[PDB]
Design a binder for this molecule. Structure first.
Ligand SMILES: [Mg+2]
Ligand SMILES: [Mg+2]
Ligand SMILES: [Mg+2]
Ligand SMILES: [Mg+2]
Ligand SMILES: [Mg+2]
Ligand SMILES: [Mg+2]
Ligand SMILES: [Mg+2]
Ligand SMILES: [Mg+2]
Ligand SMILES: [Mg+2]
Ligand SMILES: [Mg+2]
Ligand SMILES: [Zn+2]
Lengths: 121, 84, 115, 177
RNA sequence: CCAGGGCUACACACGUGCUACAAUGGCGCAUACAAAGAGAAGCGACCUCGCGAGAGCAAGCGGACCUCAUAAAGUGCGUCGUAGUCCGGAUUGGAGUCUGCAACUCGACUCCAUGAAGUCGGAAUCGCUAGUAAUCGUGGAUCAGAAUGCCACGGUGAAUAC
RNA sequence: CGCGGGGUGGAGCAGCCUGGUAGCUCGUCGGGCUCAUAACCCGAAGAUCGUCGGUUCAAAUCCGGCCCCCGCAACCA
RNA sequence: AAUAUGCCAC
RNA sequence: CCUCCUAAAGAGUAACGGAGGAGCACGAAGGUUGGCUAAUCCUGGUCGGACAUCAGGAGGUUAGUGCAAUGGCAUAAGCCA
């Protein structure tokens, strides 16, 4: 809501951000573009065909390469969504492998920073 | 380990550094990369910065490290534990 | 039936019985029996007290039981307080001779500890 | 009474010459020897206390007293009056007999014996030492030892201070370290 | 381009294998029976030394000649007598051999010692109808050293299919 | 305000009335079947009982208050 | 006897 | 019905005054004789700890009194036989 109510995935309290590194790995200005799209997720307009609840509560945010494939698996943790993994994929539909990695990161975040987010945040 | 016929292994440049530092008294820590070198008896008291991949871990050589590879006292990995 | 200060079984043959001494295996047991001139297939409860005394003398040659235990303990503790790689491995209770710890290593790490 | 004679003939002379006691009656004696085992496992199987008392009787040549709970403790699940240990007190002749047997037989049979601590004098001159295994006493047959019953031994002495107490014990060739 | 480090990290999870949980076995002693392959800064006899890894001198052979290289399971005798055990070998301590400039991270192997979990494995799940499965050893490529993998070779050798 | 109750794993409930110890279902986690998910199958962990202070050798239990949640009553003029 | 579902341009 | 306070140093004394208990237990927890003395803490001690049993000391009845509170209790009314 304050244009930055995002939380990036860490494996623990001081666990080196396992998403910021996998995000810096993303080639070139796709990083800035995806930051823009996160801002747009907090804007409330981010266009059609870009977001998809893949399976579970895991939402794929998409960008480019072939057809919207600079993919980012996140999930909504209250008002502030948590960005799990960010990855390049070629074929449509995030590989099952990457999906299952996203699910496991979701569960790990739940068991680290909490199951439901704080009362007021 | 090393065959006893070949004797112990010390790298020549580290041996030179050590002999000159010991004969010229306490000096700066021996900045060195020769992790594979052996700690000889006349190594005591020397502080030696053994490379470990990015840092030169300081090691104060004492009597009971004689016969050990200097690289053993400079660990090369970082580990604190999963989900502490 | 009390060699190096421990009870050894009387029903077993001498080679098998002497292995009960912490510090004597099959090889050292055979060496002890040969040096004390005792058959390898004789049962302990069937040896003359002179023979058991000779066996005591032989086993006294080697370091066994408490002396061996504390020797091993001081070697391990020296590794510890030196804090070399093997000392660190010993502290953490991980494999010490270069094995893999990605999987297995159950003997050092203990049984499974779920998250 | 062998060690009693040894006491009265040599240990007294050593102590007199050493501490310059003005009176011979000032020299420390050995008041009592108490052998205890706290069979805290009796609360489950009472028979365990009877068997442990049988072992103590074998060690001491003396039927033991069944010491019971002084006050109910819930942290150990004992109510008042539950028997939880057995003790024997040895004096005089059987004192000295057990004392010699201990020093000259049972202590050598201790696995990995290196020397009894000199810090076990309770600030007055009483020596308390813990025996982990009842097999060190040949009085107990090894093959029937159903369980490793330990015990603890208290040599109670007329010494005022630990220095005098340990001098008295060491004069008995007591294995300190 | 260079030296160090990492690819060997470990709360965990999965796949594919190896060794086991024993007596149709283990250990000790004697002994029979193979195929196929390799080899020239290579395979290395014989002999001497070492408890063993191996070391010294060193022939022979680019080979149906010499070496690797005694096959093992099997058979005969003894032993163990159902026990976490002479099963089982993980782990660890000490001492060592070889290769390689160099074995700490991170090699293989040997000796002494230690001797773990494991007593046939939930749901589930795989291979196989013949000399196959099962079981026993041997060789090679890669390679200075570094196979339980991979690729081949033989020995013993079934039940079942209405 | 008076009176009767209630506070127990993440949710719903037992247990407690007879002080010696906390269970059920759903859920969660791990594996399995499935191309994958749901259902399903097989294993596991989880609360130290609202809270303070007592009693008692021992308190989820008994007691006194305190906090919050329901129910009845708060009338005659 | 039970056996629900499959949204990522092509 | 029992105990303390209010209750004003004899007894007694009210309130929809302030605090707690009883509707029993015991054939021994009664009689007598003989004997013994507690709580707590510290030190030392096999498993065994803050708290089990053993030994010594300090302490002084700060314990106990089958159940409330008061008054008592060492000559014990407390604990064994
Ligand atoms: Mg493709
Ligand atoms: Mg790899
Ligand atoms: Mg074996
Ligand atoms: Mg080859
Ligand atoms: Mg090779
Ligand atoms: Mg075959
Ligand atoms: Mg009055
Ligand atoms: Mg008056
Ligand atoms: Mg009475
Ligand atoms: Mg009375
Ligand atoms: Zn002797």
């Amino acid at each position: 809501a304050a244009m930055g109510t995002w939380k990036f995935f860490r494996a623990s309290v001081d666990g080196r951000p396992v998403f910021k590194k996998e995000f810096d790995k993303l080639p070139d200005q796709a990083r800035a573009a995806l930051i823009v799209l996160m801002q747009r997720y907090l804007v409330g307009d981010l266009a059609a065909g870009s977001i998809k609840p893949i399976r579970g509560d895991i939402l794929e945010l998409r960008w480019h390469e072939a057809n919207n494939h600079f993919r980012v698996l996140f999930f909504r943790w209250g008002q502030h969504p948590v960005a799990l993994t960010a990855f390049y994929a070629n074929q449509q539909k995030t590989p099952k492998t990457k999906i299952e990695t996203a699910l496991d990161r979701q569960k790990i975040w739940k068991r680290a920073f909490g199951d439901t987010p704080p009362i007021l945040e | 380990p090393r065959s006893l016929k070949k004797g112990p292994f010390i790298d020549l440049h580290l041996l030179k550094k050590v002999e000159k530092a010991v004969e010229s008294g306490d000096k700066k820590p021996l900045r060195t990369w020769s992790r594979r070198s052996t700690i000889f008896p006349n190594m005591i008291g020397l502080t030696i910065a053994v490379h470990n991949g990015r840092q030169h871990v300081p090691v104060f050589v004492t009597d009971e490290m004689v016969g050990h590879k200097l690289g053993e006292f400079a660990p090369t990995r970082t580990y604190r534990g999963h989900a502490a | 039936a009390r060699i190096a200060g421990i009870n050894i079984p009387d029903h077993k043959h001498a080679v098998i019985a002497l292995t009960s001494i912490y510090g004597v295996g099959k090889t050292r047991s055979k060496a002890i029996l040969a040096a004390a001139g005792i058959a390898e297939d004789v049962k302990i409860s069937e040896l003359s007290e002179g023979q058991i005394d000779t066996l005591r003398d032989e086993v006294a040659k080697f370091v066994v039981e408490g002396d061996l235990r504390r020797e091993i303990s001081m070697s391990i503790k020296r590794l510890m307080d030196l804090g070399c790689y093997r000392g660190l491995r010993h502290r953490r209770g991980l494999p010490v001779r270069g094995q893999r710890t990605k999987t297995n290593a159950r003997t050092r790490k203990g049984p499974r500890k779920p998250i | 009474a062998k060690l009693h004679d040894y006491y009265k003939d040599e240990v007294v002379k050593k102590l007199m010459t050493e501490f310059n006691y003005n009176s011979v009656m000032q020299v420390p004696r050995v008041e009592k020897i108490t052998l205890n085992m706290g069979v805290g496992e009796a609360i489950a199987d009472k028979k365990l206390l009877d068997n442990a008392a049988a072992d103590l009787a074998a060690i001491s040549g003396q039927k033991p007293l069944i010491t019971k709970a002084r006050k109910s403790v819930a942290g150990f699940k004992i109510r008042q009056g539950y028997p939880i240990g057995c003790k024997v007190t040895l004096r005089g002749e059987r004192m000295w007999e057990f004392f010699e047997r201990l020093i000259t037989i049972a202590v050598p049979r201790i696995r990995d014996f290196r020397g009894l601590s000199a810090k076990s004098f309770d600030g007055r001159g009483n020596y308390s030492m813990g025996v982990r295994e009842q097999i060190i006493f040949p009085e107990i047959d090894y093959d029937k030892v159903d369980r490793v019953r330990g015990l603890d031994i208290t040599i109670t002495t007329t010494a005022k201070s630990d220095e005098e107490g340990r001098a008295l014990l060491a004069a008995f060739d007591f294995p300190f370290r």
